[PDB]
Amino acid sequence: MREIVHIQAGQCGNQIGAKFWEVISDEHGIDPTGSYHGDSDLQLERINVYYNEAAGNKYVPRAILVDLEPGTMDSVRSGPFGQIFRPDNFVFGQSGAGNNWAKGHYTEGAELVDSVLDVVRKESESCDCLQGFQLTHSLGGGTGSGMGTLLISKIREEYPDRIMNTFSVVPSPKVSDTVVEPYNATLSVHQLVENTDETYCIDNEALYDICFRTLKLTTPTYGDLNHLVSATMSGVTTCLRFPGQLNADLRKLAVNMVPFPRLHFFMPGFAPLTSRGSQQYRALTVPELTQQMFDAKNMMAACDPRHGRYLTVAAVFRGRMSMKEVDEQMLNVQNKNSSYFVEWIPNNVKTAVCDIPPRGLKMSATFIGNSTAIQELFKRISEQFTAMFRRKAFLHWYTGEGMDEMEFTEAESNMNDLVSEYQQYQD
Amino acid sequence: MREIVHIQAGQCGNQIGAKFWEVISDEHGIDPTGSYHGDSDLQLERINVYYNEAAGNKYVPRAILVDLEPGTMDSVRSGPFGQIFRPDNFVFGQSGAGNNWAKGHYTEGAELVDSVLDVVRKESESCDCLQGFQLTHSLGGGTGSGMGTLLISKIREEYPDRIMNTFSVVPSPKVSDTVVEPYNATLSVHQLVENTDETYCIDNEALYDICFRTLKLTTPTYGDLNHLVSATMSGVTTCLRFPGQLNADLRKLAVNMVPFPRLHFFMPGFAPLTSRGSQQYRALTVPELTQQMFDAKNMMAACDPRHGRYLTVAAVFRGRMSMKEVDEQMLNVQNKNSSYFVEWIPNNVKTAVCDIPPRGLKMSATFIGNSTAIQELFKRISEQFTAMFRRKAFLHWYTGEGMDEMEFTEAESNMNDLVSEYQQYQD
Amino acid sequence: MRECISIHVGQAGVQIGNACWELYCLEHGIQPDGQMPDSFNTFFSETGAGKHVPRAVFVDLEPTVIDEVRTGTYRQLFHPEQLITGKEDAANNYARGHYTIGKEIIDLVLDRIRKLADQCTGLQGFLVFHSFGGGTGSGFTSLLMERLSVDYGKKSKLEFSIYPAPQVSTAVVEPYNSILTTHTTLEHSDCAFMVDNEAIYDICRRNLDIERPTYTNLNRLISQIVSSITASLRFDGALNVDLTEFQTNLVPYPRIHFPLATYAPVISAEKAYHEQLSVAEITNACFEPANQMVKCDPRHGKYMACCLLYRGDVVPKDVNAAIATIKTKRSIQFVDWCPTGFKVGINYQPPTVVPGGDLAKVQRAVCMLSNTTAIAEAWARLDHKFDLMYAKRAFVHWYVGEGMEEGEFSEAREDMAALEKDYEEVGVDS
Amino acid sequence: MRECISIHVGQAGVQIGNACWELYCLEHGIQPDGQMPDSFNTFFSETGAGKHVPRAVFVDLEPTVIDEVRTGTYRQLFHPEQLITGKEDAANNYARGHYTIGKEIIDLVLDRIRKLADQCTGLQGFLVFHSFGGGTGSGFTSLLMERLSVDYGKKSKLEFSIYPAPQVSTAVVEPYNSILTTHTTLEHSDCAFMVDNEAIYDICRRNLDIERPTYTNLNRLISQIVSSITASLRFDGALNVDLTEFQTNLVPYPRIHFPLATYAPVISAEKAYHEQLSVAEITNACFEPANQMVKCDPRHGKYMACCLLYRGDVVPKDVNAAIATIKTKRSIQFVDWCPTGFKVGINYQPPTVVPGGDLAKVQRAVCMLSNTTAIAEAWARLDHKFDLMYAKRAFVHWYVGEGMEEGEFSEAREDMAALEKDYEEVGVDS
Ligand SMILES: Nc1nc2c(ncn2[C@@H]2O[C@H](COP(=O)(O)CP(=O)(O)OP(=O)(O)O)[C@@H](O)[C@H]2O)c(=O)[nH]1
Ligand SMILES: Nc1nc2c(ncn2[C@@H]2O[C@H](COP(=O)(O)CP(=O)(O)OP(=O)(O)O)[C@@H](O)[C@H]2O)c(=O)[nH]1
Ligand SMILES: Nc1nc2c(ncn2[C@@H]2O[C@H](COP(=O)(O)OP(=O)(O)OP(=O)(O)O)[C@@H](O)[C@H]2O)c(=O)[nH]1
Ligand SMILES: Nc1nc2c(ncn2[C@@H]2O[C@H](COP(=O)(O)OP(=O)(O)OP(=O)(O)O)[C@@H](O)[C@H]2O)c(=O)[nH]1
Ligand SMILES: [Mg+2]
Ligand SMILES: [Mg+2]
Ligand SMILES: [Mg+2]
Ligand SMILES: [Mg+2]
């Protein structure tokens, strides 16, 4: 009954993935050994969405861990919760991809990918009715980006009628940790445009801003950043995992949020978010959550929503709440902020409510916005790509892996077209 | 239901503000943690006028604390009651304004103010029906004066239909602590004339006189002075906070006290005021309070009311009192002192009564007088400004912040016009 | 944040600086090894654990004075790279300081300063200590000030200067150096506190009952003034004055940035017991010519602005009273274009006293910084001195030898003449 | 797996290698007898029980330098067959190294290398240590590199080279050797880190307060750089850089594979206590010309890519901040065809320090590897030097005697001219 298959590719994908798994096990009352020690029957009712049931009262993540480097795998296995994963679901190379999309997509990744495909087929067979796939990775490196994209293509070919979701961490110029990021992002974005049904644009810069400005966190770590992403991930699939008053799964969300096939790039947000000191001076109420969610400072993509228009927003609420209140607050936001919503889609907001709140909170919210302002993110990347490509800088490496210049030209064109399309509907 | 939004700008504004908050929390039975520990249901009935209700039986001041220096903020936070304030409501710079109105109004303050605006918008949104704003500050410095004025302008632009009240501590030549005071006051007064609906003229000199002469206080501190101001502030909004026999809020007071738009500069007074030794030799009665209030020695502005005429007086009484007695005493004062009241406004006195007296007293009174004698205060300031401006002394600093001489000329003209207008109605 | 960077140039600058750093250490409870068993951060960077380092650079063109610091009691306080020394001094020659010898060391010192400044997150500005008379104190400082002005621009620079005496002059060529440095001081300094050794000596003998006051006595006193200026940044009280604030209040015109500093009370342990040193009294004592740090007559000048910086057990009301009293005193006249000439600061911390010092411990002290036309008299005497020597071109050849041109001297003199004239003008009533 | 094979050629190569192996041993807790009372496998093979052997080959054409190793402290660390020695040296003659003397020993060394490589299951590549100036370091290494390139092909080769100084040159014929080796270095090496002894000496005197630094001081420092490069393979942290990764990031065009290495902080025990060596500070210090390992001016060149390799108590956020700060510094210019020129590595292990070493123990260190056009200046001076001597055919006869042809010299010079031109081209903006 509606199983999701999880895939983690490259370092970032793996680490975020681990965080996701940790949170989800806690949510469903699963301990580091795979045993259920929860309180409520609701925690086990839909356990099969994310876990396969093994012999002797144990649950195992329907998760595939992929990397061209074994170090990441080792790190995962040695982590808290590392032992819950199926040993046969770790699919690793020995070499690494050296921040080269071509190595990940055409060479080393190509050699690797068949094993992964074999694993995922088995995982699909195991599930009674697989609704689809969730891939966590980055676009800026070689494995997550090149290998990940390749894997996606393969998956879609075999499961063309299933939902294909990605949580993609994009490279920003402020927090620019690598040189060839523009290339890798450009190449991967193109592929994503044709083969994913919904893509959550996660930005490290935005995460840092959230941590520093909102969470008041003097020294955020990648772990802290990852936590935010994990929360968001949990939010989307809450309706699949628990009961509720109004329920929307992955498909329902897509249908309401994607009016044209290409426009499936979301700016996610999560509410509430408070400092430890500033927690006592707040109201645990729906109007507050709503206020938080639509704010630009709470979006996980480095784009100002006020620089574009919202095509659609999907809001997913967790906790015991008044439907009327939710409906009023959502109508208020669209009436007051009329100018930030496209006028040819009346009621730009879709609402879903799950009765089970996350742990530690009485209420929570997850926001998925499809904004034309996401073009900013793509534009910057394009610019950076151009800056390098005009001089054919670092191209030789890519060509050594069998790539041609023409592919670069194509990808760039494609991305530009996508950008244009978004602009068109923005008006 | 009729929320007031409080703003504190610069050192003086902050400190007086703190005092105000302390008194008000005591009045409404709120302790240093934000928890209600009062006795009467009347203390909580209208708690929402000044406090937002947070989670877990706590109340938080609808207060914004603003300064170009963080030291003031630190001092506030470390004070008794410092922890009641919302951490996100402290909006502070790092540099300071160096007693320069231009830095506060055009430069540093400009950079600062948007954060403040963001905060106050949120604070407005939170309140169900905001009746308006109360700003505490001084006119003689840089932050409170320049930044404060700027903030006022911004506020009025966004809330043109709301009541705009200031408690403005004016520079006196006796207690002249700074050199450029005349400039800062002149520039700010002008701005106040166009954008505030009512302005309480608080004078340090007068406060000192009260403390020394009336309270018999050998060594008054700024705290003691501040207390007086706080009392006055509390007095004005008693009708919004408690029940009563005849009730007048901020609007009702303004409408009765301001016959022409520009003439909204009040000389406040508070009664009773006694020494510790001289407390036992007095009568707790309405005639005594009345006697005290209309006396020149009990006005908080350094102006002799006998040097002008009263356009209007508003008297706000707190405690269980006979309406007849109040009416007789107010008629007596106007009949006996006929020559100090303008003859073309019959019944120059407006009365309001709140049944709840302040703590420690069975009865109290707050006096708001609109006297043409306030021109004295402006005239002195003008003279001092002239003395400096004639030689262009210290102008270079202001011009370094982008200011032109012409602005000075304008401000001076404006103030002179105001003075003339007051004289006109004095006759 | 709110850091201040101290630069100590030449012998005089070094020696004053030593005293200053002794005083700061005592004030913040920092031991001579940098350990402290907060506000101290205005003067000190903090490293790792149990170490505080002065935000200071010490420069001399000769090694001798700095070498003492290296060998001495506070050797662990400063890191070696902040104590900068050449090989040969400027030999009382401005030219050698500014050009011939100074051009070899200036870049290095600037680099170090930049490194120091990069470590500070809220730089208020610079405190520059140097003599007017020495070749390094004049020539080098002038050069340094230019460079700092270029690199940093709108940062406030405050210079504490040992201006030469009318009578008690130790070198022959002092007037030349003084004139030359003044020219540059005008354009690149935001506020300059001139100080006169003779005046300090008189104070030590008359007020402290010291038969034989030496430089160590002067320096200690001088440091106190600096402490009063910076106490508003290093502590907090009822009424506060930042440096920018101070500048705004005290400086009416860009060129007129020469306030006279005076400190009160300066008393002996035994003499103080009998005296009832009230706020009013000390304030009154501030405006008396005998307690001045520069030899000159305020009675013959007019006040344009005074900053009064109180510290210790002081309340506003009594300060106000004192100010009122001062207003009513006919012998203290203020210019007509300043209806109120008082900026007032009040800080809670009483002045701390150096063990083995000449000054007694008091509950309250005050530092008055006042811009009076009377200081122009000093310039007049110095100018006169310059003019005699220049009449004969005495010693001029030396300066020329080191690359200076005769025209520069004339230019400098002209500049000072213009300045004196400006000072005269502001004085007169309308 | 992930092994790296080290080859140490000639005196310089041997001596650097000694230091390196001392450092590695200390880092992995391996005693000088091979016993260790995991990641060390990147540098060591393991045999039987309580024995670890360096993945290294030491070669010299003369016995003297290697003989020291055999007699000395680490005699048990290496097996005898990995220390290869001929009888007669190349006598500062490239020809003797590459042809006459080198042809007798090259096969043997290759065989041993092959044996060594067969024992490794995940070969990352080779680290080759040698001088540019010596007959063995130039001629032999060149030959060896060719053979390795042939046999192994697509394996990464990284060469650490003691490039000759502008002033401080120890042999007369250095420019000839340097020019000749460079030609071959171009085609057969994937990345080359040039280093200059003069620069190291300056660093030792200025930053470490050492009056008289000897080769042992240089070598130790050099080893640290190598450790930083290979720490990403020998440990693990938050952000990791493999060799291939490094190459991808740092090398924009095949021929432009000459990054300059710089290490920070290099400080004394006493001098470091006072300094607050933050991430921002050390990063800033990296981009300063005074701390460079090659004598040349980056201010006159443009950056194409920099790898920053941090180690110890470091978090990403502050590295990012540092990078941002660097971006805003006008004096550090990057070419327009590189919108982000920063590859960043962060490793958890602080730098370990050799007992009796010149460097103080720090919580954090950084190794910056930056490809700047400024290095071309070194080549220009070397070329100039070459051109003078060749004008007179000075010493040429010797080379000819050992089988070299005159045409080779000209060819080599041409190649270097072409390379300099290429470097110029990449520099210019569009
Ligand atoms: N939000 C997070 N961002 C991360 C995390 N780890 C890495 N990153 C970011 O992602 C980029 C580096 O990507 P990766 O390590 O995932 C490259 P990958 O291992 O997939 O392929 P290779 O090219 O083979 O290394 C860069 O922007 C990092 O700063 C993480 O845990 N959270
Ligand atoms: N009645 C009171 N008057 C005060 C108080 N604090 C300061 N003042 C008076 O106000 C004037 C100094 O004003 P401020 O410290 O508020 C100047 P502000 O901090 O707003 O701007 P800056 O110029 O940036 O310092 C002066 O007349 C003081 O004597 C107070 O607590 N009560
Ligand atoms: N108040 C005070 N004055 C000093 C001190 N040391 C020197 N002076 C005065 O400074 C002037 C002499 O200048 P120095 O500072 O010794 O000379 P310098 O700056 O080192 O210049 P050169 O030695 O010529 O390179 C004279 O007026 C001295 O009286 C001191 O410790 N305190
Ligand atoms: N940094 C450093 N440089 C060295 C060392 N030993 C020698 N050199 C430099 O290396 C160059 C001389 O080359 P060597 O390596 O001694 O000569 P070789 O490779 O043994 O060649 P031949 O003896 O001619 O066969 C000169 O530039 C020396 O300064 C060392 O231990 N450290
Ligand atoms: Mg990786
Ligand atoms: Mg202030
Ligand atoms: Mg000297
Ligand atoms: Mg040799």
User: CATH no. for residue C423?
Assistant: 1.10.287.600
Residues counted in chain A = 427
Looking at residue C303, the DSSP 8-state letter turns out to be E
CA dihedral C105, C106, C107, C108 (to 10 degrees): 50
Q: Rg (Cα) of chain B, in Å, rounded? A: 21
> Which residue out of C20, C85, C101, C131 has the highest number of ligand 3 atoms within 8 Å of its CB and is therefore the one to mutate?
C131
Cβ of B169 less than 6 Å from ligand 2: yes
Q: CB D276 to CB C118 under 8 A?
A: no
Tell me the C-alpha distance between A227 and C91, whole Å: 68
Closest listed residue to residue B186, CA positions, set B389, B404, B346: B389
CA of C131 to the centre of ligand 3 (A): 6
Contacts 24+ apart (CB under 8 A), D321-328: D321/D279, D321/D280, D322/D279, D322/D280, D322/D283, D322/D284, D323/A176, D323/D283, D324/A174, D325/D280, D325/D283, D325/D284, D326/D283, D326/D284, D326/D287
DSSP 3-state of D165: coil
Q: Whose CA is nearest to atom 6 of ligand 3?
A: C12
DSSP 3-state of C134: coil
Distances (CA, A) of A427 to A107, A220, A341, D195: 42, 38, 11, 58
Cβ of C218 less than 6 Å from ligand 3: yes
> In chain A, which residue's Cα lies nearest the Cα of D428?
A391
Q: Are residue A277 and residue A320 in the same domain, yes or no?
A: yes
Q: Are residue C154 and residue C301 in the same domain, yes or no?
A: no
Tell me the C-alpha distance between B418 and B409, whole Å: 14
Q: Are residue A251 and residue A269 in the same domain, yes or no?
A: no
Q: Are residue C209 and residue C61 in the same domain, yes or no?
A: yes
DSSP A42-76: HHHHTGGGTEEEETTTEEEE-EEEEES-HHHHHHH
Q: Are residue D47 and residue D100 in the same domain, yes or no?
A: yes
- CATH number of the domain that D245 lies in? 3.40.50.1440
C107 touches chain D (CB under 8 A): no
The domain boundary, picked from D231, D259, D287, lies at D259
**Prior bond of B272 cis (ω within 30°):** yes
Q: Are residue C230 and residue C138 in the same domain, yes or no?
A: yes
DSSP A104-140: HHTSHHHHHHHHHHHHHHHHHHHSSSEEEEEEEEESS
Structure tokens given for A169: 């961490």
Residue C407 lies in domain: 375-430
The residues, ordered by sequence, that sit 6+ positions from D35 with a Cβ below 8 Å of its Cβ are: D50, D51, D52
Q: Are residue A91 and residue A165 in the same domain, yes or no?
A: yes
Tell me the C-alpha distance between C100 and C401, whole Å: 10
DSSP 3-state of D336: coil
Angle between helices A148-158 and A181-195 (to 10 degrees): 10
* CB distance A27 to A354 below 8 Å: no
Q: Are residue A325 and residue A380 in the same domain, yes or no?
A: no
Outline where DSSP puts E strands in D83-208. 83-85, 125-131, 156-163, 191-196
Closest listed residue to residue B236, CA positions, set B129, B364, B127: B364
DSSP 3-state of D310: strand
Residue D219 is labelled as binding a ligand: yes
Q: Are residue A417 and residue A286 in the same domain, yes or no?
A: no
Q: Are residue C225 and residue C306 in the same domain, yes or no?
A: no
Q: Are residue A109 and residue A120 in the same domain, yes or no?
A: yes
Verify whether residue C245 is a known catalytic residue. yes
The residues, ordered by sequence, that sit 6+ positions from C259 with a Cβ below 8 Å of its Cβ are: C191, C193, C250, C305, C307, C369, C370, C371
Q: Are residue A401 and residue A272 in the same domain, yes or no?
A: no
Tell me the C-alpha distance between B332 and B348, whole Å: 12
D68 touches chain C (CB under 8 A): no
Going by beta carbons, is chain A in contact with chain C, meaning 3 or more pairs sit under 8 Å apart?
no
Q: Are residue C365 and residue C251 in the same domain, yes or no?
A: no
Q: What are phi and psi of B269, to 5 degrees?
A: -145, 155
CA dihedral A119, A123, A126, A130 (to 10 degrees): -150
Closest Cα in chain D, distance from residue A91 (Å): 18
Residues with their C more than 2.5 Å from the N of the next written residue in chain D, i.e. before a break, are 37
Cβ of A140 less than 6 Å from ligand 1: yes
The residues, ordered by sequence, that sit 6+ positions from D148 with a Cβ below 8 Å of its Cβ are: D110, D113, D126, D155, D157, D188
Closest listed residue to residue C297, CA positions, set C373, C202, C195: C373
Determination technique for this entry: cryo-EM
- Please give all residues whose beta carbon lies within 6 A of any atom in ligand 4, as ranges: D 10-12, 15, 61, 89-92, 131, 133-137, 162, 164, 170, 197, 215, 218-219
The domain boundary, picked from C345, C374, C403, lies at C374
Structure tokens given for B300: 């908080």
Going by beta carbons, is chain D in contact with chain B, meaning 3 or more pairs sit under 8 Å apart?
no
CA of C134 to the centre of ligand 3 (A): 6
* CB distance A391 to A274 below 8 Å: no
B60 touches chain A (CB under 8 A): yes
The domain boundary, picked from B213, B243, B259, lies at B259
Distances (CA, A) of C285 to B203, C262, C290, C367: 30, 9, 9, 11
CA of C181 to the centre of ligand 1 (A): 59
Residues of A with Cβ-Cβ distance to B52 under 8 angstroms: 283
Tell me the C-alpha distance between A242 and A38, whole Å: 14
Which letter, b or e, does each residue of B147-174 get, where b requires 16 or more Cβ atoms within 10 Å of its Cβ? bbbbbbebbbeebeebbbbbbbbbbbbb
Counting one residue from chain B and one from chain C, the pairs whose CB atoms sit within 8 A come to 85
Residues of A with Cβ-Cβ distance to D247 under 8 angstroms: 98, 397
Cβ of C89 less than 6 Å from ligand 3: yes
The count of domains in chain B is 3
* CB distance B257 to B266 below 8 Å: yes
Tell me the C-alpha distance between B27 and B61, whole Å: 13
Q: Whose CA is nearest to atom 6 of ligand 1?
A: A12
**Prior bond of B261 cis (ω within 30°):** no
The count of domains in chain C is 3
Residue D427 is labelled as binding a ligand: no
CA of A11 to the centre of ligand 5 (A): 5
Q: Are residue C288 and residue C248 in the same domain, yes or no?
A: no
Q: Are residue D283 and residue D153 in the same domain, yes or no?
A: no
The domain boundary, picked from A229, A259, A289, lies at A259
> Which residue out of D7, D9, D11, D66 has the highest number of ligand 4 atoms within 8 Å of its CB and is therefore the one to mutate?
D11
CB atoms within 10 A of CB D333: 14
Task: State the chains in contact with B (3 or more Cβ–Cβ pairs under 8 Å).
Answer: A, C
- CATH number of the domain that D348 lies in? 3.30.1330.20
Q: Whose CA is nearest to atom 23 of ligand 2?
A: B99
Looking at residue D331, the DSSP 8-state letter turns out to be T
DSSP 3-state of C191: strand
Tell me the C-alpha distance between A378 and A186, whole Å: 9
The residues, ordered by sequence, that sit 6+ positions from C27 with a Cβ below 8 Å of its Cβ are: C227, C234, C352
Residues of C with Cβ-Cβ distance to D284 under 8 angstroms: 118
Structure tokens given for C380: 């007049």
Nearest ligand 2 atom to the CA of B96 is 24
Q: Are residue B68 and residue B145 in the same domain, yes or no?
A: yes
Task: State the chains in contact with D (3 or more Cβ–Cβ pairs under 8 Å).
Answer: A, C
Q: Which of C122, C238, C324 sits opposite B94 (nearest CB)?
A: C122
The residues, ordered by sequence, that sit 6+ positions from D354 with a Cβ below 8 Å of its Cβ are: D19, D22, D23, D26, D220
* CB distance A363 to A319 below 8 Å: yes
Q: CB D338 to CB A387 under 8 A?
A: yes
Closest Cα in chain B, distance from residue A387 (Å): 34
Q: Are residue B250 and residue B333 in the same domain, yes or no?
A: no
Q: Are residue B247 and residue B233 in the same domain, yes or no?
A: yes
Residues 270-309 in D contacting C (C-alpha not used; CB under 8 Å): 271, 273-276, 281, 284
What is the tally of helices (H) and strands (E) in chain B?
15, 13
The domain boundary, picked from A259, A282, A300, lies at A259
Going by beta carbons, is chain A in contact with chain D, meaning 3 or more pairs sit under 8 Å apart?
yes
Residues of D with CB under 8 A from a CB of A: 1, 122, 236, 238-240, 242, 244-245, 247-249, 251-254, 305, 315-317, 320, 323-324, 336-344, 430
Q: Are residue A278 and residue A416 in the same domain, yes or no?
A: no
What is the tally of helices (H) and strands (E) in chain A?
15, 13
Q: Are residue D134 and residue D238 in the same domain, yes or no?
A: yes
Q: Are residue C61 and residue C22 in the same domain, yes or no?
A: yes
* CB distance D4 to D233 below 8 Å: yes
Nearest ligand to the C-alpha atom of residue A188: 1
Nearest ligand to the C-alpha atom of residue D170: 4
Resolution in A for the shown PDB structure? 3.1
Tell me the C-alpha distance between B328 and B319, whole Å: 17
Q: Are residue C266 and residue C293 in the same domain, yes or no?
A: yes
Could you give the residue ranges of the DSSP H alpha helices within C6-105? 10-28, 64-71, 94-95
Nearest ligand 4 atom to the CA of D13 is 15
**First CA to last CA distance, chain B:** 42
Q: Are residue D254 and residue D264 in the same domain, yes or no?
A: no
Residues with their C more than 2.5 Å from the N of the next written residue in chain B, i.e. before a break, are none
Nearest ligand 2 atom to the CA of B176 is 27
Strand order across the A244-246 sheet = A90-92, A63-67, A3-9, A130-138, A163-170, A198-203, A265-271, A363-371, A310-319, A349-354, A244-246
Residues of D with Cβ-Cβ distance to C47 under 8 angstroms: 273-276
Half-sphere exposure of A100 (CA within 13 A, CB side): 31
DSSP 3-state of D272: helix
Q: CB C79 to CB D276 under 8 A?
A: no
> Which residue out of B66, B111, B169, B394 has the highest number of ligand 2 atoms within 8 Å of its CB and is therefore the one to mutate?
B169
Q: Is residue C310 left, alpha or beta, with left meaning phi > 0 and alpha meaning psi from -120 to 50?
A: beta
- CATH number of the domain that B393 lies in? 1.10.287.600
Tell me the C-alpha distance between C321 and C328, whole Å: 11
The domain boundary, picked from D244, D259, D274, lies at D259
- CATH number of the domain that B365 lies in? 3.30.1330.20
> Which residue out of C233, C236, C239 has the highest number of ligand 2 atoms within 8 Å of its CB and is therefore the one to mutate?
C239
A291 touches chain B (CB under 8 A): yes
Q: Name the residue with tokens 């001094």.
A: C89
Which one is catalytic: C46, C146, C245, C288? C245
Tell me the C-alpha distance between C299 and D209, whole Å: 58
Residue B416 is labelled as binding a ligand: no
Q: Are residue B163 and residue B98 in the same domain, yes or no?
A: yes
Residue B339 lies in domain: 260-373
Tell me the C-alpha distance between A344 and A216, whole Å: 39
Residues of B with Cβ-Cβ distance to C236 under 8 angstroms: 71, 75
* CB distance D353 to D361 below 8 Å: yes
